[PDB]
Amino acid sequence: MSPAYLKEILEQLLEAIVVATNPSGRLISELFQKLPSKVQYPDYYAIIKEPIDLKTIAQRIQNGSYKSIHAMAKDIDLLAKNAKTYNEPGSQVFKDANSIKKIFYMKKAEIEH
Template structure:
């Protein structure tokens, strides 16, 4: 079953974009609209952890969770959106991979172990060795906590705070915030190459701390840190990845 999971989450489109990227982690808990609509939230990291733990007793149980993931994405997102299209593609890919393995009588469908590893790709939201560490719950709690403090309470004349909030609160054309991937730095354990390529790592959390400590003498200085944050993301992530595009937008 592990090979089936890995084959599904590591698939890319014709441009090399990881199709499962937006399904690796659930939206932040502060996204009230999402959790009001979606009663059974699930992401690929949760599914991967269940695969590791032997939670699924059959491929049908595995398929049930994947169908739930696809159903949730289609229920919440506009039919014309990329994530809706990706959800449909993931469902098709899964069926294709499953059929291929059934035809070859792949032992993974019987629940045996495999030494296959997930492919590492340049995107913070991609599949990674996190699924082998069983720390998904803690990471989601950390992400939730970070997002709760990511908005600066400021007065109308606090231009730096207002500037910061404009970035954090920015929403795309379907009403979703896009700043979440920039809230904190990539985990050094899972993305060591990031710290080899990026000389001056910075995150929204770090910028917020500097704001609170009144480290910026002007909005211009604050803007320079934002430029550094987004240029780092554009340097590390491939041009057709969602995080690269969001960095350009912000």
């Protein structure tokens, strides 16, 4: 797998996350694009040791920082676990975080097989 080929794969995986809509038609990715401000939400950074967001993941795809699909999955897992730590089970953020993971792993299995 060439770097250029891998990049296309990772772009597809990210694309599936950011175009995914809920049953209501809303785009679940939007809240996860950019980390919450440190001024307004210090508690987030009190709790989350490794903040990450989809814009950072997107930069890393664009910079070639991921050397495999698994590398990108690690950051997807980190992002969802961070969300599921700061927010309660069943809260919309918690549920959307799982949905993003779901979308990623489904599309990863679609590509890998």
